[PDB]
Scaffold this active site. Sequence first.
Site, PDB file in Angstrom:
ATOM      1  N   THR A   1       0.814  -1.207   0.000  1.00  0.00           N
ATOM      2  CA  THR A   1       0.000   0.000   0.000  1.00  0.00           C
ATOM      3  C   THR A   1       0.851   1.262   0.000  1.00  0.00           C
ATOM      4  O   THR A   1       0.428   2.270  -0.589  1.00  0.00           O
ATOM      5  CB  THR A   1      -0.958   0.048   1.192  1.00  0.00           C
ATOM      6  OG1 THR A   1      -0.230  -0.294   2.378  1.00  0.00           O
ATOM      7  CG2 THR A   1      -2.115  -0.986   0.950  1.00  0.00           C
TER       8      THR A   1
ATOM      9  N   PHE B   1      -7.178   4.153   6.277  1.00  0.00           N
ATOM     10  CA  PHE B   1      -6.519   3.262   7.200  1.00  0.00           C
ATOM     11  C   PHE B   1      -7.524   2.468   8.024  1.00  0.00           C
ATOM     12  O   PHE B   1      -7.160   1.922   9.072  1.00  0.00           O
ATOM     13  CB  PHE B   1      -5.566   4.068   8.121  1.00  0.00           C
ATOM     14  CG  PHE B   1      -4.434   4.737   7.350  1.00  0.00           C
ATOM     15  CD1 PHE B   1      -3.393   3.963   6.818  1.00  0.00           C
ATOM     16  CD2 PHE B   1      -4.445   6.126   7.128  1.00  0.00           C
ATOM     17  CE1 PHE B   1      -2.343   4.559   6.074  1.00  0.00           C
ATOM     18  CE2 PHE B   1      -3.417   6.749   6.360  1.00  0.00           C
ATOM     19  CZ  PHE B   1      -2.367   5.977   5.837  1.00  0.00           C
TER      20      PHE B   1
ATOM     21  N   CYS C   1      -5.297   0.617  10.766  1.00  0.00           N
ATOM     22  CA  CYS C   1      -3.931   0.291  10.346  1.00  0.00           C
ATOM     23  C   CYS C   1      -2.933   0.585  11.469  1.00  0.00           C
ATOM     24  O   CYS C   1      -2.767   1.752  11.870  1.00  0.00           O
ATOM     25  CB  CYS C   1      -3.563   1.107   9.119  1.00  0.00           C
ATOM     26  SG  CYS C   1      -1.933   0.654   8.503  1.00  0.00           S
TER      27      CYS C   1
HETATM   28  C1  HEM Z   1      -0.555   4.117   2.766  1.00  0.00           C
HETATM   29  C2  HEM Z   1      -0.270   2.905   3.315  1.00  0.00           C
HETATM   30  C3  HEM Z   1      -1.274   2.053   4.026  1.00  0.00           C
HETATM   31  C4  HEM Z   1      -2.636   1.914   3.850  1.00  0.00           C
HETATM   32  C5  HEM Z   1      -3.501   2.709   2.834  1.00  0.00           C
HETATM   33  C6  HEM Z   1      -3.082   0.913   4.762  1.00  0.00           C
HETATM   34  C7  HEM Z   1      -4.452   0.524   4.898  1.00  0.00           C
HETATM   35  C8  HEM Z   1      -4.884  -0.336   5.899  1.00  0.00           C
HETATM   36  C9  HEM Z   1      -6.238  -0.627   6.169  1.00  0.00           C
HETATM   37  C10 HEM Z   1      -7.360  -0.039   5.316  1.00  0.00           C
HETATM   38  C11 HEM Z   1      -6.314  -1.521   7.206  1.00  0.00           C
HETATM   39  C12 HEM Z   1      -7.613  -2.122   7.781  1.00  0.00           C
HETATM   40  C13 HEM Z   1      -7.952  -3.459   7.024  1.00  0.00           C
HETATM   41  C14 HEM Z   1      -9.236  -4.067   7.564  1.00  0.00           C
HETATM   42  O1  HEM Z   1      -9.991  -3.467   8.364  1.00  0.00           O
HETATM   43  O2  HEM Z   1      -9.525  -5.236   7.198  1.00  0.00           O
HETATM   44  C15 HEM Z   1      -4.960  -1.766   7.614  1.00  0.00           C
HETATM   45  C16 HEM Z   1      -4.601  -2.625   8.621  1.00  0.00           C
HETATM   46  C17 HEM Z   1      -3.270  -2.965   8.808  1.00  0.00           C
HETATM   47  N1  HEM Z   1      -2.175  -2.434   8.237  1.00  0.00           N
HETATM   48 FE1  HEM Z   1      -2.107  -1.004   6.922  1.00  0.00          FE
HETATM   49  N2  HEM Z   1      -2.016   0.461   5.469  1.00  0.00           N
HETATM   50  C18 HEM Z   1      -0.887   1.096   5.074  1.00  0.00           C
HETATM   51  C19 HEM Z   1       0.425   0.903   5.482  1.00  0.00           C
HETATM   52  C20 HEM Z   1       0.804  -0.094   6.363  1.00  0.00           C
HETATM   53  C21 HEM Z   1       2.094  -0.307   6.852  1.00  0.00           C
HETATM   54  C22 HEM Z   1       3.343   0.484   6.404  1.00  0.00           C
HETATM   55  C23 HEM Z   1       2.044  -1.408   7.691  1.00  0.00           C
HETATM   56  C24 HEM Z   1       3.152  -2.077   8.417  1.00  0.00           C
HETATM   57  C25 HEM Z   1       4.299  -1.481   8.845  1.00  0.00           C
HETATM   58  C26 HEM Z   1       0.676  -1.849   7.758  1.00  0.00           C
HETATM   59  C27 HEM Z   1       0.260  -2.921   8.510  1.00  0.00           C
HETATM   60  C28 HEM Z   1      -1.105  -3.115   8.754  1.00  0.00           C
HETATM   61  C29 HEM Z   1      -1.527  -4.168   9.674  1.00  0.00           C
HETATM   62  C30 HEM Z   1      -0.662  -5.176  10.434  1.00  0.00           C
HETATM   63  C31 HEM Z   1      -2.893  -4.063   9.745  1.00  0.00           C
HETATM   64  C32 HEM Z   1      -3.809  -4.884  10.641  1.00  0.00           C
HETATM   65  C33 HEM Z   1      -4.045  -4.121  11.967  1.00  0.00           C
HETATM   66  C34 HEM Z   1      -4.914  -4.959  12.908  1.00  0.00           C
HETATM   67  O3  HEM Z   1      -5.915  -5.550  12.479  1.00  0.00           O
HETATM   68  O4  HEM Z   1      -4.607  -5.071  14.141  1.00  0.00           O
HETATM   69  N3  HEM Z   1      -0.043  -1.020   6.946  1.00  0.00           N
HETATM   70  N4  HEM Z   1      -4.102  -1.026   6.784  1.00  0.00           N
END
Ligand code: HEM
Length: 450
Positions: free
Chosen positions: A263, A388, A395
């Site tokens: 992402t 996010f 996120c």
């Molecule tokens: C612009 C960059 C990013 C976007 C647009 C993004 C978007 C998202 C979104 C929409 C979710 C929620 C998904 C859901 O509800 O099913 C999420 C969860 C997550 N993201 Fe990101 N993300 C980004 C960058 C990152 C980065 C850099 C990392 C790691 C270093 C990361 C790790 C995670 C993790 C592990 C989750 C799960 C959190 C949980 O459920 O406890 N993401 N992200």
Amino acid sequence: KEMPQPKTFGELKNLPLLNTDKPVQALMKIADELGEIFKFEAPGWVTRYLSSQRLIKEACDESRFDKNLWQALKYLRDILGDGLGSSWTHEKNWKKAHNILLPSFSQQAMKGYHAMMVDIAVQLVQKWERLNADEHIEVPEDMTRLTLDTIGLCGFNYRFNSFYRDQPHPFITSTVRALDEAQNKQQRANPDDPAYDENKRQFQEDTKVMNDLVDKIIADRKASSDDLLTHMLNGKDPETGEPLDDENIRYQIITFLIAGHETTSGLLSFALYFLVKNPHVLQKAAEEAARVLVDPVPSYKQVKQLKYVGMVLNEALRLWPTGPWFSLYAKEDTVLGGEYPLEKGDELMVLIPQLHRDKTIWGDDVEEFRPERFENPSAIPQHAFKPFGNGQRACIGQQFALHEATLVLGMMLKHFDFEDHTNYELDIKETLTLKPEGFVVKAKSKKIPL
Ligand code: HEM
Ligand SMILES: C[C@]12CC[C@H]3[C@@H](CCC4=CC(=O)CC[C@@]43C)[C@@H]1CC[C@@H]2O
């Protein structure tokens, strides 16, 4: 009262409407026709797609709705198990791993990551400084080199050395193929048909690629740090007193290696796309980069001062949030919006790019790239801007991604002028996550030393 739904195809229900390599774009067009909510049924699953801030604000009420594992996310459990993003909120390992890993995303942790993010960013700038006159840049390819290397180094003290390879790193190729298979499998009426045995074999092959890299990372750590891997190996959940076991650690390593790169690469790529298509915005962002980044290496404080670059990235996330889905389910029977009764367990899917085009929130110019929308962030209504996700399942990497992207985009704008030399026509590829496929530019160096 009665919920809109697109036409059905006998026992295939609505499934044939999603036979496409661009499903979020196809579903946005269905929302264009049917409005803020429509039901969608497949033989194997049912959901309701939400597009208005009015309804999504309700779905984000965690006393009424919890995160749902939508179909492609369920498939990813074959690789990611009960890693952070692929676990149910009530699964023991969700809260445990959340508690153990959240301090790796403190503001103090971010300050600690900064010098490593600079290391990879400098490698990107030097690659571009070293291109010859007849060459161009493959933008998402180089952004993915940067974002994979950044999570490798910051998260695991491991160098993927992606800028030392002229083809994508094998972990990238396997990530794309596996997420593409999870996307495609959703559209299959009979996924266990032997027609898909070769897809299964390939998915298992890509899983083994990922797990071989996890073994190398773990062996490396043994043979060498206060980073994500340290906390996976040594942290105890303050609530249950328990550590993660080895199986869940493996799932978390793959989780962060995937989520930490795709992402963020898509965001940087879309951001550069919108800047070259909007030269006056590019000029304003470049002026800020030159005014703020006065030293050869950007400092942590300087990146925090790149306010307009941050607005550019938020506006890029408004138009094309690069992980454009999050799903909820009803914790109890409830009526949504005063009009749509839901039963306990009913699934909802937030169509984030459509939420971000809600004209009652943003005005009629929803398709214009205007970073000034984010000049005062407190003026954006609650739950109108959700790139996010939401709530305790939002996120965990959001601040990491934005710090990396602000640093890198600032250095890019400081060090080069950019040319849209092909007059690139936006083509959004979907492999769960979004990217501008084929986006290329030429960079003319401003000849500013590192
Ligand atoms: C612009 C960059 C990013 C976007 C647009 C993004 C978007 C998202 C979104 C929409 C979710 C929620 C998904 C859901 O509800 O099913 C999420 C969860 C997550 N993201 Fe990101 N993300 C980004 C960058 C990152 C980065 C850099 C990392 C790691 C270093 C990361 C790790 C995670 C993790 C592990 C989750 C799960 C959190 C949980 O459920 O406890 N993401 N992200
Ligand atoms: C499962 C996951 C959180 C959800 C992510 C997934 C990567 C692919 C992806 C793309 C999207 O468009 C929605 C979010 C999802 C479905 C991430 C890989 C690791 C993280 O835990």
